[PDB]
Design a protein around this ligand. Structure first.
Ligand code: ATP
Ligand code: MG
Ligand code: ZN
Ligand code: ZN
Lengths: 192, 702
């Protein structure tokens, strides 16, 4: 009914925004403000934030980010989006991404077990081959071919995902959908 | 708020919709009745008390408090009434938390809408708008169940497709099955579906309103879920509803022009009449002890008919009725007092029957002609308006526990005659028509009016050879009222004053007791739930009937029979019931004997009638104040004198007079000897009478 709130992710997002607008470098100025300055530029959409700083500022926040990275990552990106919207004049629809660096611990590729699924890890390997850069659908807006209702912002989970059901309840359509490419959003995607 | 574009979509929009919702809650919570009486708290309270799921909101009050909602209400009433229903549900659930398991939907009925349009004036301008109209319900379907929240079965995998709202506009048709994704056939799951009550009525303009010479117009209306069975064919109602265009009727079948059928979605129905169970027996009983309740009751029937007091006694007796009884289960005797008024024309017989139809509960009216809605005989056929195969049980069984009023009794069919004979002898009607072999009960009291043969009652003949009814039909009546019309200047003048007065006081630019008012009269007659009983005076009755037999054989008369004493028992029980006695007192028996004897004597031809009047004056004069007896005598004397004058002189001398000797002789004949009370009586003067003592003459100035 009231859009059940992921309270862990919401708290993580608020604390991340606080770290963003409050953490300061050695000289004493808010470093990620100076770094989000570069992020106004087109072709610029990732803010690289060091995990050492995140540990220094808020230990519980960094632990939550490390332990539940996959569920809270969109909220970290939303916090970055609000962090930059007020400062500057970005396009409304631009998407911003957060990159973490300097994890103190490194895992072996043998150690990438099913207990590490969905949590922040750093690995080292040797690049064998890189594929081309493609656009990847991250959320498509679909049209029901039965009742012409637009189901919007259905999230792809690394697979082409159609809406489970048509939003129109007297239409139980689960097969016949049309993607609206111009109404959908993509990300740059490379498989290596 | 206000509008920046069309009202329907403006109040559909989320912002203004929510504002309207909050404002209507504010209204329902904060409306006082000009005397601090918080109307809606108590209204919700009593509605929940009796589980009514419908809240009536006065449009005057809504407009006075908040005029923007009132101005938006008739422009887009579908949306506004939806909002109002949601807000009413919220306010009720806030006031009563436990009422969600009673109805889960509150209907708001808008009252006293000022937009009163007559049916002939609805146009395409009015479409989708809340209108108020008035008219007469002409037809009404039964309450039908209509799908409300319909669950469907996928009859390919049996999944139950979730509840879909059923709008009034179109059939809800599911798309795919959520599980198996079949478009294929579905069916209503009638166990998981919830239904709502549905009823179509046709309402036409009241015939009084349609005036110039033109035909009345009718509209269909749809009553839903609380409004059903609030009307009835014949009711005059006020209808508030949405003038509706868009469901499935548009004449696309090239059957003609692309015209649209319209309906009114009724939102509020208000009948135009009074609203039959008694709570104060106390007043009835207080009147019962009045010791003169009988004469008040008799004077209280047919108040708009002048005179005819004997007919009024008979009709009151019949209206109260006697005691049915059936020893063992094999000797049925009715308690119904059937009354037959036979009288020459223009003597208020039909007015008497219409009065009885007005006062009696379960009275139905029928005629010997073909000019009636109900007919005496039962038949089975397809109903003209319903199209529905119906056992059209006759007017004799439609009045099974009440009274059947048959006007123009002598002008019946042979079929009608055998029907009335069966109902009035067996108190049942036997069908053998289609495949229907049934017997169905007609325990009515029959009150009939007939005309004499030749249009004038001839007292030279007996009642039987005056009326054009067979003996078996006449014998099944307790009271035969011969309504004999004569020229009497005083009675003519009183009647003329009466009727001209009725014409004066009903212009469009506008005897010893007081008649008991007709509403408490109806209530008093509802105290026929006290069955009663007698243990009084068999000896006098038996000798009365033996002497009646000997006189009735000693002349060539219609003989008294057992039937007459049983009718006397019925009448005595009826008279005792008038007094709520619970027992039959000797004056009840004496009054019953008087009524039975008067009916029996007047039935006789003139000679036997007069001889019997002489030889039974003792019985016939009970409860007569000896002023009426003298008045009858004096009137007969002066009438004989005027019929002498009109013949010897052709014309009559005004200020007719008769000598006191004749009156005193007749008074000694009836053993009065006291005429001073008569002379001083008001009855004397009211009949335009006077006498001169020194003249020794009594006179009538006209
Ligand atoms: N005694 C009376 N008091 C008041 N009105 C009377 C009386 N007698 C006759 N009328 C009036 O006379 C009119 C004729 O009455 P009504 O139609 O009842 O007579 P009727 O006996 O039915 O005649 P018919 O035998 O021709 O049917 C009525 O409008 C009635 O109001
Ligand atoms: Mg008549
Ligand atoms: Zn659909
Ligand atoms: Zn199915």
């Amino acid at each position: 009914h009231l859009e059940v709130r992921d309270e862990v992710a919401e708290k993580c997002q608020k604390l991340f925004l606080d770290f963003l607008e409050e953490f300061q470098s050695s000289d004493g100025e808010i470093k990620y403000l100076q770094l989000a300055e570069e992020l106004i530029r087109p072709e610029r959409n990732t803010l690289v934030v060091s995990f050492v700083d995140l540990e220094q500022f808020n230990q519980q926040l960094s632990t939550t980010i490390q332990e539940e990275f996959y569920r809270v990552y969109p909220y970290l990106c939303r916090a970055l989006k609000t962090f930059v919207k007020d400062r500057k004049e970005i396009p409304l629809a631009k998407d911003f991404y957060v990159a973490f660096q300097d994890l103190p611990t490194r895992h072996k590729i043998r150690e990438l077990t099913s207990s590490r699924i969905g949590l922040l890890t750093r690995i080292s390997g040797q690049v064998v081959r890189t594929h081309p850069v493609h656009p990847e659908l991250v959320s498509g807006t679909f049209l029901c071919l039965d009742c012409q209702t637009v189901i919007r912002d259905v999230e792809q989970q690394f697979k082409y995902t159609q809406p489970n059901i048509c939003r129109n309840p007297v239409c139980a359509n689960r097969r016949r959908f049309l993607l609206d490419t111009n109404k959908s959003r993509f990300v740059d995607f490379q498989k290596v | 708020d206000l509008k920046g574009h069309s009202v329907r979509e403006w109040v559909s929009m989320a912002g203004p919709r929510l504002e309207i919702h909050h404002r209507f809650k504010n209204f329902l919570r904060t409306h006082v009745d000009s005397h601090g009486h918080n109307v809606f708290k108590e209204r919700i309270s009593d509605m929940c008390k009796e589980n009514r799921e419908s809240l009536v909101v006065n449009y005057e009050d809504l407009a006075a408090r908040e005029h923007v909602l009132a101005y938006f209400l008739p422009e887009a009433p579908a949306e506004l009434l939806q909002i109002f229903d949601e807000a009413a549900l919220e306010v009720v659930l806030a006031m009563y938390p436990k009422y969600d398991r009673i109805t889960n939907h509150i209907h708001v009925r808008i009252s006293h809408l000022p937009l009163v349009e007559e049916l002939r004036s609805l146009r395409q301008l009015h479409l989708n708008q809340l209108i108020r109209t008035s008219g007469v319900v002409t037809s009404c379907t039964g309450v039908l169940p209509q799908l409300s929240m319909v669950k469907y079965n996928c009859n390919k995998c049996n999944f139950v497709l979730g509840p879909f709202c059923q709008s009034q506009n179109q059939e809800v048709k599911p798309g795919s099955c959520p599980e198996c994704q079949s478009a294929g056939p579905f069916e209503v799951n009638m166990e998981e579906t919830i239904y709502q009550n549905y009823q179509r009525i046709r309402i036409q303009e009241s015939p009084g309103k349609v005036a110039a010479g033109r035909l009345p117009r009718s509209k269909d209306a749809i009553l839903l879920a609380d409004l059903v069975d609030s009307c009835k064919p014949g009711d005059e109602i006020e209808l508030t509803g949405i003038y509706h265009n868009n469901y499935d009727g548009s004449l696309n079948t090239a059957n003609g022009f692309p015209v649209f059928a319209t309906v009114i979605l009724a939102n509020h129905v208000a009948k135009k009449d009074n609203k039959l169970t008694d709570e104060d027996v106390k007043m009835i009983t207080s009147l019962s002890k009045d010791q003169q309740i009988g004469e008040k009751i008799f004077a209280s029937i047919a108040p708009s008919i002048y005179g005819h007091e004997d007919i009024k006694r008979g009709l009151a007796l019949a209206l109260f009725g006697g005691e049915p009884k059936n020893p063992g289960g094999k000797h049925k005797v009715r308690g119904d007092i059937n009354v037959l008024l036979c009288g020459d024309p223009g003597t208020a017989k039909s007015q008497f029957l219409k009065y009885i139809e007005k006062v009696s509960s379960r009275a139905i009216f029928t005629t010997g002609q073909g000019a009636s809605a109900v007919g005496l005989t039962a038949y089975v056929q397809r109903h003209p308006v319903s199209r529905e195969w119906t056992l059209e049980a006759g007017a004799l069984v439609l009045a099974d526990r009440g009274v059947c009023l048959i006007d123009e009794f002598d002008k019946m069919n042979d079929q009608d005659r055998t029907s009335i004979h069966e109902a009035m002898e067996q108190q049942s009607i036997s069908i053998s028509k289609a495949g229907i072999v049934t017997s169905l009960q007609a325990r009515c009291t029959v009150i009939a009016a007939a005309n004499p043969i030749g249009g004038r009652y001839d007292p030279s003949l007996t009642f039987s050879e005056n009326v054009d009814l067979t003996e078996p039909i006449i014998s099944r009546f307790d009271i035969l009222c011969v309504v004999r019309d004569t020229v009497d200047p005083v009675q003519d003048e009183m009647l003329a004053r009466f009727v001209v007065g009725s014409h004066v006081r009903h212009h469009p630019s506008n005897e010893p007791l007081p008649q008991e008012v007709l509403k408490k009269y109806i209530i008093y007659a509802k105290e026929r739930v006290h069955p009663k009983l007698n243990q009084m005076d068999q000896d006098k009755v038996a000798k009365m009937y033996s002497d009646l037999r000997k006189e009735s054989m000693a002349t060539g008369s219609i003989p008294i029979t057992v039937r007459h004493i049983e009718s006397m028992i019925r009448m005595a029980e009826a008279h005792a019931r008038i007094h709520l006695r619970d027992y039959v007192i000797e004056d009840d028996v004496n009054m019953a004997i008087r009524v039975m004897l008067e009916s029996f004597i007047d039935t006789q031809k003139f000679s036997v009638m007069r001889s019997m009047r002489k030889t039974f004056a003792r019985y016939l004069s009970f409860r007569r104040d000896n002023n009426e007896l003298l008045l009858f005598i004096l009137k007969q004397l002066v009438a004989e004198q005027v019929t002498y004058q009109r013949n010897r002189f052709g014309a009559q001398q005004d200020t007719i007079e008769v000598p006191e000797k004749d009156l005193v002789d007749k008074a000694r004949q009836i053993n009065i000897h006291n005429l001073s009370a008569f002379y001083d009586s008001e009855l004397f003067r009211m009949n335009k009478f006077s006498h001169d003592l020194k003249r020794k003459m009594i006179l009538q100035q006209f």
